[PDB]
């Protein structure tokens, strides 16, 4: 079928959580730029696509659809038989099992990390100190976590990546390779070692090496 | 088929989430009690089923759940073909329709109004006006956004209550009859329509007469 479309630029965490399954599951894609330094995602004619002004959005020759984490779901029960298969399970228990750990980056581990990453790498007031401490030790806890977790399995739920994984990756990694603060992932050594395994998993790699092709 | 289990007291908004969705989908349950106020939901032997130390946890024979919507999604999955049926769709367009206004929940209504409930209603310590003016001018443009939305369908994906509304019914219920922030919802009259209509759901009343009697 047709490409496709995504609209946003790759340096975004939400459109790259959106490229990754896109490509993890075999899917063509064009990508439509949408210029946040002319305010471009604030201006009308996006807002009729994204009622929120924001990216990503997502269009088929179905639907449009936008939140990052609803274009993966489609994405991946639209194309359940192609590329990896078992990225959101293959059934209704191993997809619920997945989905308890995607909630819990929606949830827990996306409002600290996310906005530590807005406040570190994409804010225009001057940084708080107190506000970032707030948020890595808030993140710290929740690593606490997972790093408990990740000595019994080797994924956040299991023993193959899935969805639950690659949801963490656009903050994760903006996080380890752009702020002082890797060491909340890469000191705890379970989480070291999936943080590893995940962001050098062919899929991620292509997302980083699309934000160099600007 | 026997009942499910769910942990946690109906005054906790993640617990009413998930008992609507039980009720909606006409799934027998049983509900074991979690005290907030006294930190049962960190007893040891409930972090191992809550790492977290969070309500609501779901049991059934196959699965054990964390995670309301997580919760929900797999509720309505098992049991696609009871009670009501459209709750989540009825295929892959319908419910993608509705899953990304699920996360519009997650992402973009549910924190500031659940900072809001948080601080009004189930803090210990003294509100902080300047914060509390932050989360309702937030949820203000979220609600404009809404009102907008709400003016071309009658739910927020479209014509038929969906999981996406009654994911806005915990947060929503507090904030309208128990805070003085319900001027948020009922001075915009598409919005209050709408809100007249989810919130008198025969499901939504009888997780409010649970609550009142727990
Ligand atoms: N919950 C949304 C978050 C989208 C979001 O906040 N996107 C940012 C970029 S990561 C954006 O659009 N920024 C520009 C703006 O908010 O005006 C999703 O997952 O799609
Ligand atoms: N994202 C979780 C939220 C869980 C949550 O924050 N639950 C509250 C009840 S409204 C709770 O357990 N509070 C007690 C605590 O965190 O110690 C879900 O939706 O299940």
């Given at each position: 079928?047709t490409?496709?479309?995504?609209?946003?630029?790759?340096?975004?965490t939400?459109?790259?959580?959106?490229?990754?399954?896109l490509?993890?599951?075999?899917?063509?894609?064009?990508?439509?730029?949408?210029d946040?330094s002319?305010?471009?995602?604030?201006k009308?004619?996006?807002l009729?696509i994204?009622?929120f002004?924001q990216?990503?959005?997502?269009?088929?020759?179905?639907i449009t659809?936008?939140?990052?984490?609803?274009?993966?779901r489609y994405?991946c029960?639209?194309?359940a038989?192609?590329?990896?298969?078992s990225?959101?399970?293959?059934?209704?228990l191993?997809?619920?099992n997945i989905?308890q750990?995607?909630?819990?980056?929606?949830?827990?581990?996306?409002?600290?990390?996310?906005?530590?990453?807005?406040?570190?790498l994409?804010?225009?007031?001057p940084?708080?100190?107190?506000?970032?401490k707030?948020?890595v030790?808030?993140?710290a806890?929740?690593?606490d976590?997972?790093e408990?977790?990740?000595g019994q399995?080797?994924f956040?739920?299991?023993?193959?990546?899935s969805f639950?994984?690659?949801?963490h990756?656009?903050?994760?990694?903006?996080l380890?390779?752009?702020?002082?603060?890797?060491?909340?992932f890469?000191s705890?050594?379970n989480?070291?070692?999936?943080?590893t395994?995940?962001?050098n998993?062919?899929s991620?790699k292509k997302?980083?090496?699309?934000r160099?092709?600007?």
């Open positions: 079928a490409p496709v479309t995504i609209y946003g630029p790759p340096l975004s939400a459109v790259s959580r959106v490229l990754a399954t490509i993890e599951k075999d899917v063509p894609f064009h990508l439509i730029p949408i946040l002319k305010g471009e995602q604030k009308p004619e996006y009729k994204q009622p002004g990216v990503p959005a997502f269009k088929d020759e179905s659809l936008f939140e990052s984490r609803a274009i993966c994405i029960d639209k194309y038989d192609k590329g990896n298969k990225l959101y399970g293959t059934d209704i191993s997809k619920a989905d750990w995607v909630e819990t980056d929606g949830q827990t581990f996306g409002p600290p990390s996310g906005d530590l990453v807005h406040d570190l994409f804010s225009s007031v940084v708080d100190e107190a506000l970032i707030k948020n030790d808030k993140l806890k929740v690593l976590i997972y408990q977790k990740l399995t080797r956040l739920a299991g023993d193959e990546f639950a994984d690659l949801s990756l656009p903050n994760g990694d903006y380890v390779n752009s702020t002082d603060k890797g060491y909340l890469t705890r050594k989480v070291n070692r999936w943080w395994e995940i962001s998993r062919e991620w997302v980083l090496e699309m160099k092709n600007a």
